Design a protein around this nucleic acid. Structure first.
Lengths: 98, 103, 78, 98, 96, 77, 98
DNA sequence: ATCACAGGATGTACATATCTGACAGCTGCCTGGAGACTAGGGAGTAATCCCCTTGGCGGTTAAAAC
DNA sequence: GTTTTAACCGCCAAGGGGATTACTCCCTAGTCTCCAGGCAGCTGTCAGATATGTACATCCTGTGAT
């Protein structure tokens, strides 16, 4: 019988690891491509400095982490341990983004 | 003799005065205003640097990194309130796990 | 179709850093949409700043100013 | 060939303060940039508050009193009072010397 | 004659969303403002317009907070607001 | 004087906010929140008044205090 | 017999605009005060955005294009484009006249 | 028959040795800050007014309390 | 639904101080000159990143047991 951790030990291990670490969690090239694709709609033939993309990635990851913390709080409020899109919608509505 | 030395400050009083004059804040800038602002800036920098150095020593490091600054800011209540809407690059987040999610 | 570049493991890692223990399968599309909206706003402001400067390169300072205008001040990039 | 145009930052002053508070602790480039940006942000906040205070009172000069009120309005609790004490000490010493 | 438990609540909701006058009595709120200001500076005087502005701001803030609290309560499959709903709303807002 | 914000007043404020059913413990929490909000706004207003060397808190002081906290209020100057 | 001091307000211009958009419609004193505060707030917002735009680009003059960029930054979409159209039309007419 | 250990498997914190590149220190220089004056008006201070804030007081009843 | 109370309103009265005006002086903008503090540029070296192997920490399931 192969060893198997129960469903939630590895999740807590990941939580601890990614809260101890500080490196960016999104791949750099896909994020740069997404930024360029979005910027295409505002002005054609735009160039980007590397520091600009790094700052955009840092801000986006910080915003997503804060939103996920709020989503976790909302899901815990509903006596759940699973985050759902309704939790994100409630968090963004209370924050005042919707 | 520098105006910073007269006030017993390490921050540049003259540079702060020039920035106040050339910052489009008021028609005139007082003499004691740059001294007071330099003192306040030096005090805040000293507080954050002391807390960051404590964090670095707790992490067995001798050089302050952005993680130490983030830990220092978010662990101090008043500093966290001051920088509530400020994001520190490469600072990460605090190790907070909700009690309901623990085994 | 670069929004799919933000893969499911990336969103899972971001949630883990946020402290989420269990993630529904519909979270990823909502997260991608929210990220797209946020990036659209920030990039629009940054491109406005760049165009006002008569430049063709979006600089880090433009992004910092755009974030500050939206109450999301960023430290470490000037 | 040609030296880059000089860009003024608060690096040396932050380093002096760090050596005052931690003689053996150093600082990284990213941390120094973060400290410089923090100093710039606080300077902008205090100066803008002082300017608004002067405008509200129909005054043309920013003095120690206006900055002090800006500090009291912007810094929370013990930070505000300690900053006030430090600034008043600095101003008193400066006026006592010359 | 007795209305069922919730008809009058809906009627009051409609009435107070139609109306625009202040919902807190003027004198108790003025006394609270003076009591709070006593801890900051003594022998303080207040203009009537200042107290009216404070009352308007406080009522708007409380109405928005109660809207967020109602949303939180609905999120938890409830129709009754509880202190935990208010705490969650203030935590998501960034006030506590 | 915090008790001057009576239970019917809090109920009316909740009704304006669309709340249909109110727990009995809502009132103390609402009083505390209102006290904190008023403390912050009044502290800022008194700071503005003291800087002006005035002894009367004006409507403009309250407006500036609210605007500083991202709560701009129209109708008072 | 002490005449009150002159307090400037946008009341007459708001009344003229109201008569343009609604001839048989009035405005109360409180609503007029609210509109005056709205005009003042938008003026302050746009002027501050233009000032920081000029400071960022190391310029000492607030021009039409700085105000245009401030309007584009601060207004939400269709409002921004219509405000830009109105401003450009007014500036063109003013330049054409004298 | 449901509950504490036994022990195996996995992961992580912990010495230890290399190496490197980023940080701290030294140097030249130039530009911005300091010294030394003058002009002028912004602001500190005194006098005055009146207004607008505060205090009180009785009656009504709507609202608060139960 | 019933009982209580203080909010509200109308009125009156006193005076604290907000606002205005006048005067004057001293504090700061402005200018010129001078010099040294700070910034760009090099450069050496050691703090930390990177393996690397190891000692626990912890989780999980079987299993003996009172």
């Amino acid at each position: 019988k192969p060893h198997r951790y129960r469903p939630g030990t590895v999740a807590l291990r990941e939580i601890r690891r990614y809260q101890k670490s500080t490196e960016l969690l999104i791949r750099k090239l896909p994020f740069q491509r997404l930024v360029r694709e979005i910027a295409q709609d505002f002005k054609t033939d735009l160039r980007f400095q590397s520091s600009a993309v790094m700052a955009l990635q840092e801000a986006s990851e910080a915003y997503l982490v804060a939103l996920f913390e709020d989503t976790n709080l909302c899901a815990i409020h509903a006596k759940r341990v699973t985050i759902m899109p309704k939790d994100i919608q409630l968090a963004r509505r209370i924050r005042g983004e919707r | 003799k520098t105006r910073s030395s007269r006030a017993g400050l390490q921050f540049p009083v003259g540079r702060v005065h020039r920035l106040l004059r050339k910052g489009n804040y008021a028609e005139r800038v007082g003499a004691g205003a740059p001294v007071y602002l330099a003192a306040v800036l030096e005090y805040l920098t000293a507080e954050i640097l002391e807390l960051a150095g404590n964090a670095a020593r707790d992490n067995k490091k001798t050089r302050i990194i952005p993680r130490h600054l983030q830990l220092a800011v978010r662990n101090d209540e008043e500093l966290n309130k001051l920088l509530g809407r400020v994001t520190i690059a490469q600072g990460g987040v605090l190790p907070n796990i909700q009690s309901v999610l623990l085994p | 179709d670069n929004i799919q570049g933000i893969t499911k493991p990336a969103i899972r890692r971001l949630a883990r850093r946020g402290g989420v223990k269990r993630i529904s399968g519909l979270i990823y599309e909502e997260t991608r949409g929210v990220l797209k909206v946020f990036l659209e706003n920030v990039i629009r402001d940054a491109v406005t700043y760049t165009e006002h400067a008569k430049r063709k390169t979006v600089t880090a300072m433009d992004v910092v100013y755009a974030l500050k205008r939206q109450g999301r001040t960023l430290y470490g990039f000037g | 060939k040609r030296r880059k145009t000089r860009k003024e930052s608060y690096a040396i002053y932050v380093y002096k303060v760090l050596k005052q508070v931690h003689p053996d602790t150093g600082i990284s480039s990213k941390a120094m940039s973060i400290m410089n940006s923090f100093v710039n942000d606080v300077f902008e906040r205090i100066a803008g508050e002082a300017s608004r205070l002067a405008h509200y009172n129909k005054r043309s000069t920013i003095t120690s009193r206006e900055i002090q009120t800006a500090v009291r309005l912007l810094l929370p609790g013990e930070l505000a009072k300690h900053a006030v004490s430090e600034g008043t000490k600095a101003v008193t010493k400066y006026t006592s010397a010359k």
